Structure 1
């Protein structure tokens, strides 16, 4: 469970979907976090992998609160399980006890430098006593689709992991009005090698 004192990540999944005929659709999940204590990772170990200087991970952690910082290790399923005009997208859902407008910023980094940034504003929906935020079928940018295609063309999974050693995604969720940090999730990737498919391990980012 990825949750700070103000916001909780309920679900997250990146996928590709194909239309096999007018009434048939296939969907392949690359990564997924669906709906206990976490092991810790020192945030200083990953500083070099994210953009630093103004608005960087170090400045974000220093600004606080520390309870909002998480690291997700993903083992993405890049096996061609469906035959590919496919749609590549991301779906996620968050929740809070307070009604607020959020801003979800996703920074894609390559060698610690930001190459793509997507910003989406989400409005609170009152649902079962709590406030829910849904980003449904958010399309992937061409940079990411072309990156997945290029990894899928490497003949070995250890080659894909070598490339992915320099690829990270930083997700920062802030309160739109106050600009307060609600949730920060650093994503690191490897390619899945088990018949169980895509895997994930969540950690809490700490300092000492």
Structure 2
């Protein structure tokens, strides 16, 4: 491992990320469960990116190609321990969503690509285009309550039916998420988060660990 300071370059920083299930009990009463969360310039250890290439798509526009183009300090591995300890009612009051916030000193238009991958193959891509808001002397890029795709909702349901967390972890060995934030107009990679998953051993907590991706 190589430990050094630089989720975020000096051009874009991830400030907040949270994936959640919000359940309406009645028009004035809601419960929200967090599956994972970030944010609720440190030294980061490193991971050799070559050991994750087979967990993500790898041809035109794939992870290896993106990393080669750089900047390499925009690339991170995120290990999540997800909290699956919640009810999953099957009714209209259930909303599965993701909220994220990025910040920059520069006013840009950014594209956020989220690729859901199974056995290293893309099964869903979500693409969101975001313009900046000036706030507190910087530019903020917020995605509020972006709906989860059907594949992900069904996948959470499937994991929850397993009787032991170690069985969920075995299934998750082949599940990854690739988040790439790009300057829409210049096509510069601003942030790339390669995400891997286990289930948290806490009863009501989620955890994460961030690593820099390095070429060897």
Q: TM-score, normalised by structure 1?
A: 0.97
| 2:3 alignment partner in structure 1 | none
Partner residue, 1:87: 95
- Are 1:63 and 2:63 matched, yes or no? no
Q: Report the equivalent of 1:137.
A: 145
Which of 26, 34, 40 aligns to 2:39? It is 34
Tell whether 2:55 aligns with 1:49: yes
Q: Is the 8 A contact 1:5 1:67 kept in 2?
A: no
Moved over 4 A (4+): none
Q: Aligned residue for 1:100?
A: 108
Deviations 1:149-185, CA, capped at 9 Å, x for gaps:
0000111111110110000000011000111111000
User: Which of 186, 200, 211 matches 1:192?
Assistant: 200
For structure 2, which runs of at least 5 residues remain unmatched after alignment? 1-5
How many residues matched?
A: 207
Aligned to 2:156: 148
1:2 is aligned to 2:7 = yes
Can you give the 5+ residue segments of structure 1 that lack an aligned partner in the other structure? none
- With normalisation by structure 2, the TM-score equals 0.93
Specify the SS of the correspondent of 1:2: coil
* Partners of 1:30 and 1:83 in 2: CA distance: 12
In 1: Cα distance, 2:182 partner to 2:111 partner: 5
User: Please, which of 178, 181, 196 is the counterpart of residue 189 of structure 2?
Assistant: 181
**Residue 196 of structure 1, CA deviation:** 5.3
RMSD (Å) for aligned C-alpha atoms: 1.2
Aligned equivalents of 1:196, 1:67: Cα separation in 2 = 33
